[PDB]
Amino acid sequence: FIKRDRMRRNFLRMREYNEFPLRAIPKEDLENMRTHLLKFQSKKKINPVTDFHLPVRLHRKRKTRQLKVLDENAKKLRFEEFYPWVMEDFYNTWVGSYEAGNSDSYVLLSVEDDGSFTMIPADKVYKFTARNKYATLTIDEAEKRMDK
Amino acid sequence: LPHFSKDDYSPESKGFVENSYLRGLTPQEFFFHAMGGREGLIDTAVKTAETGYIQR
Amino acid sequence: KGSRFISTLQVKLYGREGSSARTIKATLPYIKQDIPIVIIFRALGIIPDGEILEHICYDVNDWQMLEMLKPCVEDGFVIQDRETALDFIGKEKRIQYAKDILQKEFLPHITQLEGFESRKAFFLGYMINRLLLCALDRKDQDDRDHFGKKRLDLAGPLLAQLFKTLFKKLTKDIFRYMQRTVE
Amino acid sequence: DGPTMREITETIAEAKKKVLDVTKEAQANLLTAKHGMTLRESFEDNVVRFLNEARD
Amino acid sequence: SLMSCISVGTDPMPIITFLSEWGMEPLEDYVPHQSPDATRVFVNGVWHGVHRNPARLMETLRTLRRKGDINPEVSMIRDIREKELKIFTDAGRVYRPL
Amino acid sequence: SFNQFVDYTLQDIICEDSTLIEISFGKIYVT
Amino acid sequence: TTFRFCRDCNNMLYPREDKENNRLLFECRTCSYVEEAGSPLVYRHELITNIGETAGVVQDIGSDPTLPRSDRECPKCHSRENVFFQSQQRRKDTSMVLFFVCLSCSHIFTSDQKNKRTQ
Amino acid sequence: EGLVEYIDAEEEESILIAMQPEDLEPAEADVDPAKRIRVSHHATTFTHCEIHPSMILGVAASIIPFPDHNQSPRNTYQSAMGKQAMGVFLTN
Amino acid sequence: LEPGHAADQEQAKLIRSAIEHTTLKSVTIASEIYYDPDPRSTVIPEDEEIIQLHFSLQQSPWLLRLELDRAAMNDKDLTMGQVGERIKQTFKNDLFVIWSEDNDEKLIIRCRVVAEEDHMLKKIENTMLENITLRGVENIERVVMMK
Amino acid sequence: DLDLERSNRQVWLVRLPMFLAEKWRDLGKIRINKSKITLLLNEPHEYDLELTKKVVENEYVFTEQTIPKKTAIVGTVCHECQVMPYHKIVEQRRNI
RNA sequence: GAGGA
Ligand SMILES: [Zn+2]
Ligand SMILES: [Zn+2]
């Protein structure tokens, strides 16, 4: 058989239910009171700070204008919040860390004794980890123990 | 080749060209044969350079 | 993009088979030498062993794999806390140096932002998992040639690189003249 | 010639059949690896030998 | 070859967004020992999460590609036996029609 | 590839480490 | 074998001897948690492994297009519908035996006619 | 309309292409001896069918008549030579 | 072969055995460290039956127990007799060594040192698997008779 | 006074399709049913809810006004859920 | 660049 160019003619020829208002909190109480998140890790499931101990304090451990590497302030500001915060007594401790994972879509529902729920935009989120639970760390001594 | 199931060891699945050059090769066989042939070309190209250096 | 920065993290498994003490040392950019991994894991905040193995051997029956791991655990048993780990890396600044390296040079293509150590930890664990899987002979070594693992730089990306470089240079010089206008 | 052709064909067919039988046996784990080589290698060699004998 | 073309690359974000919208438990909450059947979900080789019932997910993704919603030059593998589901909007890949 | 470049990549090369201690870079125009 | 973790420290519970009643004692060498053993066994090497052959049998494998299909009748179930594949051991000296997966009762069974196998 | 689909090397790993539309999947059902020995359909769960196999060839190879009857090195030689042939390269 | 013996395939098998380098690792199946402080009663009730013999007609509490394949033990034509000889003579200084008998359906070999054990013992087992040439000579891997 | 205030407020958390979340970082009315919830908007679309994790353990909420500063620990995570989508009209808007 | 052989 052969290649046929007559096919142009071929086609051419062929052709309980609760309900609550979800009020917006005052800007002002927020304006100082940033909200964040608590996450411990020990798997001592309960981790009640009330039953942790007491007292429980919480605190964070040339010429004219020349060349500057630019960045949005917040990250710069985030960069400049690098004192992680702890719970102690004056013995058990916990140290938090910045999650930076889902600040985007997390709205805290003000589950108060009242049924009204205020939708609190979670501001940050921190992961808390114990420490000095055996105070056994030889930061310079240990480096000696490595080579042996 | 994606045209096959997995773990087929039948001769044509692993490259047993069967038709003659007269009958022409089915597209698999054609490809397989192309692989073999290129191996041939490469070997020839390398072998001449080797033997040249050896002889020198 | 973004002044495309190619950092090639590698993981090395030490010692041939049977050669006792097969330990895994990772390689980081701008680091004296390889690092036992468990150091890195703690440096990312996964402190306990059990959590680390959870980050690596996803099934708790793979005692095969766990046995493979145990030497690295024992290797790292010296260090036991994050900041010590960061100390290992090379002041009063050494710690901060380590931390910033991780936030900018460890796995750039995950993020260079602040808090994702959970991510890079998990991902590293996975990488190790695959390396182990190979060295246990359950996958074959990677095929260097599988065409899926290749890319072709057409005129677009070639000019992209070229022009990015040129323009970076142009900015540098414009800034320099700005300075020379101190007068 | 025609007759020669289909004779060739059935020769090839016999080859395929022998390969298949070897395969079935191997997958029944009944294949006995000749000493000094892997079971898998033994099977693979057998197949290659059959196929070359067939071609010739 | 004659019909092969070459991907030009696509912003991945909307895909990730959609994934989160359809499951894909984010990474930070992944607890292997209790979620043993999760399919790791990658994108341009960036492990972004895990997910259960990957089958329906893959189905949906395929369908979406098959009506232009996801740019059709996007590849989407689902290795059943490795519980992985890679995706690539990467530029430079080579592909052919079918 | 070339169209893609000259339409997006060109711009996003600029809208990058552009501003200089200040000088800004905006819309890019091609004749 | 298994590993053990200091249910408080959560770390490698190394073994140790009682030294008087002389039974095993796993001790967290990060902490003070100590326990005996459930077994006298401590470690096992397994230089030739029959495991990893049929790996990744997910309850999805039937959906794989590329996998072949046989007719061989399920022993447990009695379907004639099955996906089969070689061992995933991926070692050079690996048998050729096939592992059939019934598509109804998802019951693995092997092509082998030497004996019975379970990966 | 989703009748055709773009496939790259990675995804190729997990599909099951059929070579020829019809014969590869009509059903399970005298042969011209001169015709080559096509294998079978032999499988059911295809997911894609090749558009036309002759498209694996590149440009230069597509010039060759019946390249499926030639010994591959010959094909390669022709592919190389075809770029020497005299001929009209441009109409202007 | 020497002319004897020119064509005695049997002789050839003898020699092939005699020269092929055969290591312990190649014959065993899996190695396990147990804690049995009992001198004379294996925690396992299977090696215990062996302890009814092979025990008698200053120790360590850590048994190292070994499993070999009968098929390989016979293709290599080996007897737990000889292997016991091998390991014994390789030390005789530290290890009471006990093996299942070549009759026994399973190839079971037990050893105990005479501390900080359970780690040195690991080194010992590695050395046993690797650095022990049961028969034959180094660097000789596969010997294949031919006509 | 370095310490908490109550440290017990048991609160709820949800994850919202971000097309709706950004609207809420600057009221509403909700069908809070049994283990079956849909969400009526303070209006366009209609949305559903799931209970991701009833046991909301280890984890609580705090707030803030060797550097210390004042802190007020709100209290616990009472529980948490996640938002899903008029889901057809939403899905029609969702695919974009 | 090219490239024949
Ligand atoms: Zn402990
Ligand atoms: Zn069945």
Side-chain angles (χ1 to χ4, degrees), chain A residues 16-61 66-136 142, chain B, chain C, chain D, chain E, chain F, chain G, chain H, chain I, chain J residues 4-85:
Chain A
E16 145 66 59
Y17 20 89
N18 194 318
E19 285 105 74
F20 284 123
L22 298 325
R23 251 322 288 154
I25 216 55
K27 218 88 53 182
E28 304 66 4
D29 91 273
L30 219 152
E31 104 87 1
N32 305 320
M33 237 51 199
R34 290 154 209 153
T35 318
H36 303 324
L37 241 300
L38 305 168
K39 328 172 76 176
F40 308 84
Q41 250 329 104
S42 72
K43 200 198 166 188
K44 218 160 293 177
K45 250 59 65 198
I46 175 174
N47 294 87
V49 276
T50 61
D51 334 12
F52 141 75
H53 219 256
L54 241 114
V56 200
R57 308 205 281 275
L58 174 49
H59 64 74
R60 305 183 66 103
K61 184 189 143 165
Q66 33 120 39
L67 183 49
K68 291 301 299 178
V69 164
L70 318 168
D71 150 46
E72 72 88 7
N73 207 28
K75 188 267 181 175
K76 170 210 139 203
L77 293 181
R78 300 302 66 62
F79 189 22
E80 294 186 34
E81 313 179 9
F82 59 105
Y83 297 103
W85 38 34
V86 201
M87 13 296 310
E88 319 86 322
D89 302 296
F90 203 16
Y91 53 114
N92 328 325
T93 47
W94 282 94
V95 183
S97 295
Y98 183 23
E99 183 92 304
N102 300 321
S103 159
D104 42 21
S105 169
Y106 270 140
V107 197
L108 213 56
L109 325 184
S110 168
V111 172
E112 40 204 336
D113 331 355
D114 170 23
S116 81
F117 300 137
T118 299
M119 308 292 93
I120 321 161
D123 186 54
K124 268 188 184 181
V125 42
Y126 282 84
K127 197 81 191 161
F128 291 86
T129 28
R131 196 138 321 190
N132 238 20
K133 182 54 66 170
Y134 300 88
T136 25
Chain B
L1 280 185
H3 317 229
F4 297 93
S5 143
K6 287 189 166 166
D7 317 5
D8 181 355
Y9 289 99
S10 66
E12 77 292 51
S13 38
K14 291 188 71 31
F16 178 58
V17 173
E18 157 179 350
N19 319 272
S20 108
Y21 275 98
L22 171 85
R23 277 176 172 179
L25 280 30
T26 71
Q28 297 83 313
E29 305 159 328
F30 177 89
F31 192 71
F32 288 162
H33 186 46
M35 298 168 75
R38 187 196 291 278
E39 185 182 39
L41 290 210
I42 285 165
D43 282 6
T44 270
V46 128
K47 186 264 314 194
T48 78
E50 296 301 277
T51 63
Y53 172 69
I54 266 184
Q55 183 265 19
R56 163 185 158 80
Chain C
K1 54 182 206 163
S3 195
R4 160 195 291 270
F5 290 130
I6 295 86
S7 91
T8 117
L9 165 111
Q10 332 191 7
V11 167
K12 301 173 174 179
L13 171 58
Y14 277 104
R16 291 302 183 290
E17 176 184 7
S19 170
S20 53
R22 283 217 273 182
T23 189
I24 317 172
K25 281 177 183 183
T27 275
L28 276 77
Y30 302 157
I31 293 303
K32 39 192 189 277
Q33 73 271 336
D34 277 280
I35 320 296
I37 54 178
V38 204
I39 286 173
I40 297 96
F41 270 53
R42 270 139 186 178
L44 287 182
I46 297 81
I47 308 307
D49 323 341
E51 264 176 288
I52 284 175
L53 308 192
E54 183 90 9
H55 268 46
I56 287 186
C57 162
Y58 301 131
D59 148 83
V60 203
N61 306 267
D62 196 331
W63 56 266
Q64 207 67 45
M65 186 168 306
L66 307 180
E67 253 69 356
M68 290 281 310
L69 295 143
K70 142 181 293 203
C72 286
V73 161
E74 307 190 7
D75 172 295
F77 163 68
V78 160
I79 300 206
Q80 213 76 18
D81 187 2
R82 172 168 183 166
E83 305 75 345
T84 46
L86 285 107
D87 173 37
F88 211 121
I89 338 283
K91 21 192 294 97
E92 176 253 343
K93 52 236 176 31
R94 224 207 172 183
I95 261 54
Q96 197 53 216
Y97 194 58
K99 174 186 302 300
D100 271 9
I101 273 311
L102 300 212
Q103 288 348 84
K104 286 169 178 259
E105 309 315 311
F106 189 50
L107 305 184
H109 80 302
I110 310 238
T111 158
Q112 298 168 314
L113 300 195
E114 221 177 11
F116 292 100
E117 305 75 349
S118 183
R119 262 182 240 276
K120 314 213 189 202
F122 255 116
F123 180 77
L124 167 59
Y126 154 88
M127 172 166 337
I128 276 167
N129 179 32
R130 258 167 48 81
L131 168 125
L132 273 236
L133 221 28
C134 168
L136 288 210
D137 299 307
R138 306 199 217 163
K139 317 266 277 240
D140 304 329
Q141 100 168 27
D142 232 312
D143 183 312
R144 201 62 66 91
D145 292 328
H146 183 319
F147 209 49
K149 318 309 197 212
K150 262 73 182 322
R151 301 286 187 268
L152 296 198
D153 293 349
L154 275 177
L158 299 185
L159 295 200
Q161 306 174 356
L162 188 50
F163 174 92
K164 156 184 302 181
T165 278
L166 281 217
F167 182 65
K168 203 175 184 208
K169 170 186 301 189
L170 174 69
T171 45
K172 275 200 306 192
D173 282 19
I174 249 332
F175 167 80
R176 151 166 322 155
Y177 153 98
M178 269 303 127
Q179 259 195 352
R180 190 187 160 187
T181 33
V182 282
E183 48 70 41
Chain D
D1 139 280
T4 297
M5 273 315 298
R6 57 98 179 79
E7 151 140 346
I8 282 181
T9 287
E10 70 125 348
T11 281
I12 296 289
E14 159 234 287
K16 312 285 205 55
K17 175 178 310 308
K18 268 182 220 156
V19 147
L20 171 142
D21 294 3
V22 150
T23 279
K24 293 228 282 183
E25 147 168 359
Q27 303 171 347
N29 200 219
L30 297 187
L31 192 71
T32 297
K34 86 196 61 189
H35 181 75
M37 61 164 48
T38 311
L39 191 143
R40 195 165 265 98
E41 305 163 320
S42 322
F43 157 88
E44 247 292 324
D45 143 287
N46 283 8
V47 154
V48 181
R49 173 173 73 254
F50 283 174
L51 260 46
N52 285 309
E53 291 179 12
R55 173 190 42 173
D56 314 353
Chain E
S1 45
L2 266 204
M3 308 188 87
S4 76
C5 317
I6 292 188
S7 59
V8 277
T10 303
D11 176 286
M13 289 296 308
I15 315 189
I16 342 171
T17 293
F18 178 84
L19 288 152
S20 44
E21 283 282 354
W22 277 71
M24 188 179 133
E25 314 171 13
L27 201 36
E28 291 75 331
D29 323 354
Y30 174 50
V31 181
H33 62 56
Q34 64 187 73
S35 351
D37 311 2
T39 291
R40 306 188 284 280
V41 171
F42 293 64
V43 166
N44 316 20
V46 183
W47 185 1
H48 273 73
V50 318
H51 167 97
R52 332 179 180 198
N53 175 10
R56 197 185 84 215
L57 168 57
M58 192 44 187
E59 164 48 51
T60 291
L61 273 178
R62 198 149 272 156
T63 281
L64 263 205
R65 178 142 61 75
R66 285 172 177 176
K67 56 190 198 179
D69 279 313
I70 308 185
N71 183 317
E73 96 173 17
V74 161
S75 15
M76 299 140 38
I77 309 98
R78 188 229 159 159
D79 175 308
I80 303 193
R81 202 199 313 265
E82 303 330 295
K83 323 181 116 188
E84 312 204 339
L85 164 20
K86 298 119 165 320
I87 292 189
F88 299 85
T89 99
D90 181 8
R93 271 157 315 120
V94 148
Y95 60 94
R96 70 207 186 92
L98 269 186
Chain F
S1 116
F2 182 96
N3 285 351
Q4 162 82 10
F5 165 84
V6 86
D7 288 359
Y8 301 68
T9 295
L10 209 51
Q11 175 58 80
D12 309 11
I13 273 191
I14 308 303
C15 263
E16 212 189 62
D17 54 351
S18 64
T19 34
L20 284 198
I21 258 42
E22 219 68 20
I23 305 202
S24 77
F25 289 126
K27 210 156 168 54
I28 168 63
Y29 298 70
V30 198
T31 147
Chain G
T1 169
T2 330
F3 279 12
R4 353 274 310 100
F5 296 86
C6 165
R7 178 202 23 69
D8 338 345
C9 259
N10 189 269
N11 298 134
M12 266 324 296
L13 257 198
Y14 296 96
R16 229 167 38 156
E17 191 160 4
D18 154 88
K19 332 296 180 59
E20 304 65 28
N21 344 25
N22 321 304
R23 15 144 192 88
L24 256 156
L25 274 191
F26 291 110
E27 39 108 334
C28 157
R29 64 171 48 212
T30 76
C31 116
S32 315
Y33 186 15
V34 183
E35 289 176 340
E36 42 38 78
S39 146
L41 148 68
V42 163
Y43 151 81
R44 158 187 182 84
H45 198 324
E46 267 278 342
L47 37 128
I48 29 187
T49 74
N50 315 25
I51 52 185
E53 307 165 320
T54 316
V57 183
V58 306
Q59 330 74 320
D60 211 341
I61 204 144
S63 81
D64 195 353
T66 92
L67 289 179
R69 267 142 234 260
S70 117
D71 76 316
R72 195 183 317 275
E73 183 239 340
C74 175
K76 278 257 310 303
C77 146
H78 292 264
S79 143
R80 313 211 65 98
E81 298 61 16
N82 32 45
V83 156
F84 64 97
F85 46 83
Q86 283 204 313
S87 135
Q88 310 314 293
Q89 162 59 216
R90 308 270 69 75
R91 191 181 318 167
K92 299 178 174 66
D93 59 285
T94 322
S95 311
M96 298 297 242
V97 202
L98 292 185
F99 302 102
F100 292 83
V101 170
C102 171
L103 251 332
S104 316
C105 59
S106 163
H107 154 253
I108 264 64
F109 64 109
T110 151
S111 59
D112 178 277
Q113 297 184 20
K114 275 282 208 76
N115 54 295
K116 26 182 184 174
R117 229 273 208 282
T118 5
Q119 141 78 329
Chain H
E1 313 183 43
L3 319 169
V4 92
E5 204 178 49
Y6 280 152
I7 293 304
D8 85 324
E10 278 299 324
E11 189 157 352
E12 226 150 24
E13 257 287 358
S14 70
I15 41 181
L16 183 55
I17 307 187
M19 286 296 322
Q20 279 184 338
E22 44 0 294
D23 206 340
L24 271 312
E25 45 211 331
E28 142 70 11
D30 37 330
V31 296
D32 192 271
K35 290 179 180 177
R36 64 201 72 188
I37 304 298
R38 303 277 184 179
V39 275
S40 294
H41 11 52
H42 157 261
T44 96
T45 104
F46 298 82
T47 81
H48 299 59
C49 169
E50 210 87 29
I51 293 190
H52 189 293
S54 48
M55 310 318 285
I56 68 189
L57 301 194
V59 158
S62 313
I63 305 307
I64 304 173
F66 294 103
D68 47 335
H69 296 269
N70 267 7
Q71 177 200 359
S72 2
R74 294 301 153 180
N75 290 335
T76 310
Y77 292 136
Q78 160 63 38
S79 333
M81 264 177 304
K83 323 178 189 306
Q84 324 285 275
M86 288 186 158
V88 197
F89 63 96
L90 271 199
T91 359
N92 68 339
Chain I
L1 265 59
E2 63 91 349
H5 315 176
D8 173 29
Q9 169 184 9
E10 178 47 49
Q11 178 58 42
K13 301 189 171 185
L14 311 175
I15 283 194
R16 149 128 91 81
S17 78
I19 115 187
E20 170 170 11
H21 183 288
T22 313
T23 150
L24 185 45
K25 146 192 185 178
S26 43
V27 83
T28 182
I29 306 181
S31 80
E32 294 168 332
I33 300 192
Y34 287 63
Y35 180 73
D36 193 6
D38 178 302
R40 293 303 220 273
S41 337
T42 291
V43 184
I44 306 96
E46 156 197 332
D47 306 9
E48 215 146 18
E49 166 279 337
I50 295 172
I51 318 304
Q52 318 318 295
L53 359 160
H54 215 139
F55 64 150
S56 301
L57 205 144
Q58 60 94 13
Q59 273 176 29
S60 149
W62 292 104
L63 138 82
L64 160 51
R65 188 229 208 193
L66 299 182
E67 160 122 39
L68 337 145
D69 152 46
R70 193 144 278 248
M73 269 288 285
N74 294 247
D75 137 283
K76 310 289 175 51
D77 293 295
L78 296 185
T79 103
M80 295 195 264
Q82 348 132 302
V83 221
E85 318 312 314
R86 275 300 272 157
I87 325 174
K88 283 185 162 173
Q89 62 74 51
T90 333
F91 296 101
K92 293 155 323 293
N93 308 132
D94 325 69
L95 299 90
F96 187 12
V97 184
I98 293 88
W99 48 86
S100 42
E101 249 192 6
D102 293 293
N103 105 87
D104 314 5
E105 73 313 325
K106 287 241 183 170
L107 316 194
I108 324 132
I109 325 184
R110 307 174 79 263
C111 356
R112 297 181 156 98
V113 204
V114 192
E116 312 87 23
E117 304 182 40
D118 334 333
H119 171 67
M120 295 285 96
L121 178 39
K122 219 89 122 77
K123 330 290 306 301
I124 275 357
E125 83 78 17
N126 134 277
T127 303
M128 292 324 104
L129 296 197
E130 275 49 66
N131 318 135
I132 295 308
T133 290
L134 275 54
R135 99 209 308 189
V137 55
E138 276 44 47
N139 340 308
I140 269 60
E141 308 322 301
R142 281 156 51 244
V143 180
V144 283
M145 301 182 29
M146 317 273 303
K147 256 187 179 179
Chain J
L4 60 99
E5 70 292 28
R6 151 185 173 170
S7 61
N8 195 21
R9 291 166 204 78
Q10 317 75 3
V11 319
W12 274 31
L13 177 56
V14 91
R15 174 132 83 266
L16 179 56
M18 70 311 288
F19 91 108
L20 190 39
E22 81 293 59
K23 206 186 189 75
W24 301 22
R25 303 197 185 265
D26 139 80
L27 59 139
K29 7 117 294 328
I30 164 66
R31 171 147 324 277
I32 313 142
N33 195 306
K34 283 306 298 297
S35 297
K36 38 186 173 176
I37 283 95
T38 186
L39 288 69
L40 184 54
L41 280 217
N42 210 152
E43 325 171 17
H45 329 89
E46 173 66 30
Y47 306 73
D48 354 310
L49 180 135
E50 62 82 54
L51 299 192
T52 356
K53 202 133 313 304
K54 264 53 58 226
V55 39
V56 277
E57 241 329 293
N58 176 281
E59 297 224 10
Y60 323 86
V61 176
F62 87 108
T63 35
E64 186 276 334
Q65 19 286 283
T66 309
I67 286 199
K69 204 167 184 71
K70 326 89 190 178
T71 322
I73 291 76
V74 168
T76 111
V77 181
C78 187
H79 167 63
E80 161 281 336
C81 320
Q82 177 227 327
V83 187
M84 48 292 311

